[PDB]
């Protein structure tokens, strides 16, 4: 009675070290319990010594199995026990038949005993363990001989549900270690299902093994099954071939019918606060976030004092996981979360290159640029064999970060390392030199860097015959070099490559506005806007060309048209504010082109609302102050702008022209010299300085300045050529 409650407390906990002491105690009554307890203690003791291996030979004769034969044939011989203990003795007898290599009589036993009539509610755990291993062993006996698929369904699906019932069971008891047959019944079912093409029941068994509550010994199984199920969610299934885990599979699917329904299953998740993923990508995301947590639980983190082969599998598995995360958040375009996930993945890689590099691309696709450059530095440290790394670092350093010195260094590290990549090496080195040429102070240094970028662009143009960027940015650096027909030739090479480009057609039209082909360039803008309507910069080109050969009416039409397009595409981000201000100021330039100061005052006031201290707005305000006959006010605003950007050119032009009017020839001399130092390629600087020289009498250099301005005017576009972006 109570002795059965203490020994039952030892057997429900599966404690196999006190049982010979319990039968050493258990007393007077003649029983057959000692043979079953000692024999099961020697079979389980043999499993604690020598577990069973997959793909094993028919064993026998073994003296330990002869002992177990004595225990089982003794307990079955005398019969001083209950009937179910003799049933389980027949199950261990047929298990001995399976190990030794008996085929027909084993199936005779498993057809005779019967486990499905044995209940599942209020069952002691050791009964679930022996009987569950009898489900797995029973299916194995069904399979080691040549609907058998339905028998796999029976013994393996019942083995799975009742095995989960045993694991949740034993966690339920211990709160109040994995075996071979658990792996056989759990894995063999779905593995055979995908051997059969039974996709539907494969996913069904996956969701059955997953909707069960987590057992501490199934965490490996749950992680691996979340991995495999995530695989099949991403590589075989779509949203139309998807069904919720709370729902039913279809019957006529490219990827079977249920027979029975058990009396008891494991604890399945449900309720009101649960989340049910309504498409395959959400469910993969859940599976792999779980697999990410469990991936840190299973991590060794390369401790590696003397621990390597038990580490690399922990790394490779996580690699599969995060690769799947990359596909998941990738096809959905959620790259900031991807960067957070791989940033959680970065606890692994010490020298492991792939994690750093995927992490870098992850930071790069999500707009993070500075950290991306750091990570690319570390990726240079890891693998110097790749030019893509310093090439991307050069891309981000010449982009929004604007790190031209760094971009030079990374580009140098590209040049130190086929021609399709090194051509990009001199291309990034050339764009770097050009951006440095724009942002330099002296004339001589600017010309040095211009010749450097011109040389590098010639190099990248030679190294690649099929690059629209070598030809195009070569034509652009030559356009800044003012050599027009040559740049036109390279533009003919660019459109010769691709005739459907925005910047290529844009440079064609700007160069045709430099050679004063007005309706030709305007037609190039007509085509380029007929195919690229919402492009802003081509529309600005339409504004200027209409100011050339159309007049102010159609120009205002284009300006309000661009108001329609800005109000169309937007309501946000920063640069649309500047684009709108460009529209207001271009329209204001039209009203100035007529000579109407009030309308331009309104336009530049609406621009002024956007950016009040913008130097272009102050410059337009100064032009209006020129229109209203206030040279002092215009002088004031033109000094307003030259404290915003002292390197702005036109404000020095018209400011020092006011100084040429007001007789202060000294300041006009100085400021015009400094305007030469900033940008000597703007002609009106040389007009103003030449007229100060005419206000001084030095007519030799005066006519040299006027010839300067004339030739520069011969090399002048409508819009300055820096408007076409220098971006890789």
């Amino acid at each position: 009675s109570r002795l059965e409650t203490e020994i039952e407390r030892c057997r429900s906990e599966c404690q196999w070290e006190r049982i010979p002491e319990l039968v050493k105690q258990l007393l007077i009554a003649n029983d057959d319990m000692a043979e079953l307890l000692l024999g099961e203690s020697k079979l389980e003791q043999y499993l604690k010594e020598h577990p069973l291996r997959q793909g094993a030979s028919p064993r026998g004769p073994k003296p330990q199995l002869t002992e177990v034969r004595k225990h089982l044939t003794a307990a079955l011989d005398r019969g001083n026990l209950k009937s179910e203990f003799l049933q389980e003795s027949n199950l261990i007898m047929a298990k001995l038949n399976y190990v030794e290599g008996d085929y027909k009589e084993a199936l005779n036993i498993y057809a005779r005993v019967g486990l499905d009539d044995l209940p599942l509610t209020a069952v002691p755990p050791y009964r679930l363990r022996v009987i569950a291993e009898a489900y797995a062993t029973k299916g194995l006996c069904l399979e080691k001989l040549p609907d058998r698929e339905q028998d796999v369904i029976t013994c393996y699906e019942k083995a799975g549900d009742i095995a989960l019932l045993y694991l949740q069971e034993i966690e339920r008891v211990i709160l109040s270690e994995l075996g071979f047959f658990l792996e056989t019944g759990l894995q063999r079912a779905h593995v055979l299902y995908f051997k059969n093409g039974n996709l539907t029941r494969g996913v069904g068994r996956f969701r059955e093994l997953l909707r069960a509550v987590e057992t501490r010994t199934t965490q490996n199984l749950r992680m691996t099954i979340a991995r495999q199920l995530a695989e099949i969610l991403l590589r075989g299934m779509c949203e139309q071939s998807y069904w919720n885990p709370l729902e039913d599979p279809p019957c006529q699917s490219p990827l079977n019918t249920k027979t029975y329904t058990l009396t008891r299953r494991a604890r399945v998740y449900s309720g009101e606060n649960i989340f049910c993923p309504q498409e395959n990508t959400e469910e993969a995301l859940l599976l792999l976030l779980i697999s990410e947590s469990m991936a840190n639980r299973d991590a060794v983190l390369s401790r590696i004092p003397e621990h390597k082969s038990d580490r690399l599998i922990s790394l490779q598995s996580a690699s599969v996981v995060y690769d799947l995360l990359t596909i998941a958040l990738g096809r959905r375009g959620q790259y900031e979360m991807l960067s957070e996930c791989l940033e959680r993945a970065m606890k692994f890689a010490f020298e492991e290159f792939h994690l750093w590099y995927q992490f870098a691309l992850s930071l790069m696709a999500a707009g993070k640029s500075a950290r991306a450059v750091k990570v690319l530095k570390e990726c240079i440290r890891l693998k110097p064999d790749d030019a893509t790394i310093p090439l991307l670092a050069a891309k981000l350093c010449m982009g929004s970060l604007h790190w031209l010195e760094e971009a030079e260094k990374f580009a140098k590290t590209v040049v130190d390392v086929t021609s399709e990549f090194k051509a990009k090496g001199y291309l990034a080195l050339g764009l770097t030199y050009s951006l440095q040429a724009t942002d330099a102070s002296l004339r001589g240094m600017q010309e040095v860097l211009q010749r450097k970028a011109l040389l590098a662009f010639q190099r990248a143009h030679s190294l690649s015959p099929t690059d629209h960027q070598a030809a195009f940015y070569l034509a652009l650096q030559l356009a800044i070099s003012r050599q027009i027909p040559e740049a036109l030739g390279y533009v003919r090479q660019a459109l010769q490559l691709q005739g459907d480009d925005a910047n290529s057609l844009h440079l064609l039209a700007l160069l045709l506005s430099a050679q004063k082909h007005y309706h030709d360039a305007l037609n190039i803008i007509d085509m380029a806007l007929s195919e690229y309507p919402e492009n802003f910069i081509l529309l600005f080109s339409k504004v200027k060309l209409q100011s050339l050969c159309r007049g102010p009416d159609e120009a205002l039409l284009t300006c309000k048209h661009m108001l329609q397009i800005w109000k169309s595409c937007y309501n946000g981000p920063l640069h649309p504010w500047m684009t709108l201000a460009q529209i207001w100021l271009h329209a204001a330039e039209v009203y100035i082109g007529i000579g109407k100061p009030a309308e331009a005052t309104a336009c530049t006031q609406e621009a002024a609302n956007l950016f009040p201290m913008s130097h272009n707005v102050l410059y337009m305000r100064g032009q209006i102050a020129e229109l209203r006959g206030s040279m002092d006010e215009a002088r004031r605003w033109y000094e307003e702008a030259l404290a915003i950007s002292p390197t702005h050119v036109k404000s020095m032009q018209r400011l020092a022209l006011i100084l040429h009017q007001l007789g202060r020839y000294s300041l006009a001399e100085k400021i015009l010299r400094d305007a030469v130092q900033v940008n000597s390629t703007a002609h009106e600087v040389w007009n103003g300085l030449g007229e100060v020289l005419q206000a001084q009498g030095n007519d030799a250099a005066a006519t040299e300045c006027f010839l300067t301005a004339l030739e520069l005017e011969a090399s002048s576009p409508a819009v300055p050529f820096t408007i076409i972006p220098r971006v890789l």
Partner: protein
Amino acid sequence: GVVEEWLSEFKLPNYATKSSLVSSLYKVIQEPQSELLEPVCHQLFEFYRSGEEQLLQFTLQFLPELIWCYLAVSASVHSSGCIEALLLGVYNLEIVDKQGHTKVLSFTIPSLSKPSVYHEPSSIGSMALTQHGLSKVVYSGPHPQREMLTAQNRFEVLTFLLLCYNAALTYMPSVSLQSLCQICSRICVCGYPRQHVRKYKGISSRIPVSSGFMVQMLTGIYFAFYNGEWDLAQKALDDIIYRAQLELYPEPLLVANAIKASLP
């Protein structure tokens, strides 16, 4: 032409079924140098017109042919310029024609701080207790329509007509991955020194396909690996890696490289 007899004989769900039109497509409409493919494509629009998923899901299987020939010849020899508006009409009927509203795709992110169908956050320690839980994000929407296909949104339209194949993976046949992944294998390195190694014949022009098109074509290649098409998808994804490396698109090299480190 046998298919000419088919069009002569055709012009209510029982009219769906057919493998004779695919074989007679192999022996009649293998050549694209015939301008009678246009109205029958509109007939394929008729199979697209109704809500029947059958006619769609096995008569939609020949449009990448006209994408490569019609669109490689058109968007670069004569060309008509009409089926861009047919595919654009399919785009409109995908973004709008479900009930009458535009389609706003948006999932919600899971969380380890949330009870869910697979786990519990309560009994676990203070790791996953505290992040924006139970919140929604938008990944495709909202997206207006387009009248006639131009070069600003030719690959946005192509991009979401490819997103139509991002929802109908399992229902595809193998031939769809064959032609779809061979043609999508050659579109990416078409104007580069990599097609010299591939020796894929056709026009030697660089096609300005965009980053999203490459991501949502990498999902398609990634479905093509696991239907026997191993080497073609492998070399194709390698070409995507090369194009992403020269073009410096981060995320396609991110994803595709994550594929390269995810194959046995």
